[PDB]
Amino acid sequence: AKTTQEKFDALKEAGVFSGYPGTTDAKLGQDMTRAEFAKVLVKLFGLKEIHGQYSYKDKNYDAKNWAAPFIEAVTAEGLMQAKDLTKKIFDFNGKITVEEASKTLVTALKLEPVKDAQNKATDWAKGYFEAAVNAGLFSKDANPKANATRAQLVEAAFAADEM
Numbered sequence: 001a002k003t004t005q006e007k008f009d010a011l012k013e014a015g016v017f018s019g020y021p022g023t024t025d026a027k028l029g030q031d032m033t034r035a036e037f038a039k040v041l042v043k044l045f046g047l048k049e050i051h052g053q054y055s056y057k058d059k060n061y062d063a064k065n066w067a068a069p070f071i072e073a074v075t076a077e078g079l080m081q082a083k084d085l086t087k088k089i090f091d092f093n094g095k096i097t098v099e100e101a102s103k104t105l106v107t108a109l110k111l112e113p114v115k116d117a118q119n120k121a122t123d124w125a126k127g128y129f130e131a132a133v134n135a136g137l138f139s140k141d142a143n144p145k146a147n148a149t150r151a152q153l154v155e156a157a158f159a160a161d162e163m
């Protein structure tokens with residue numbers, strides 16, 4: 001019965017979340033960005049931020065971009081990668097679908113995708129979305145093809161942290 005905001009507040013006490021500068025609004029109903037998901041992965045899984053390195057050519061991907069040390073850490077692990085692998089564009093403000101987040105979290109948690117799963121996800125992601133639902137990361141009624149909200153990543157992170 002813990003509310004999503006209560007889960008956010010617990011995770012903020014734990015250092016996994018921090019919210020936005022200068023405001024207490026967690027913006028739980030907005031879509032999470034790729035940069036924000038990289039940060040949460042680093043904190044959840046005990047990865048080390050990598051400073052001073054820039055693998056991507058996106059505009060404003062530089063030392064003034066708060067998310068670069070997190071993005072570099074998850075990139076070096078193979079947990080995330082460029083949206084355009086040839087042009088080296090990460091798309092840091094881009095969105096992330098439920099099924100994409102499922103793949104990444106299941107991998108990071110060392111969970112195994114379910115073979116021969118039947119669900120609404122894209123074919124390549126069905127096993128991962130099923131594993132994520134079975135592990136309590138996302139609701140069985142989540143739309144795997146929709147962009148994941150910050151709320152959903154709070155719920156997922158809270159569940160992953162408890163594991």
Ligand SMILES: CO[C@@H]1O[C@@H]2CO[C@](C)(C(=O)O)O[C@H]2[C@H](O)[C@@H]1NC(C)=O
Pocket residue numbers: 016017018019020021036037039040066
């Ligand atoms: C713009 O500042 C960032 O905001 C990010 C929002 O999303 C998450 C995942 C969060 O912890 O809520 O990450 C935040 C970044 O850490 C950063 N916030 C701060 C306070 O520096």
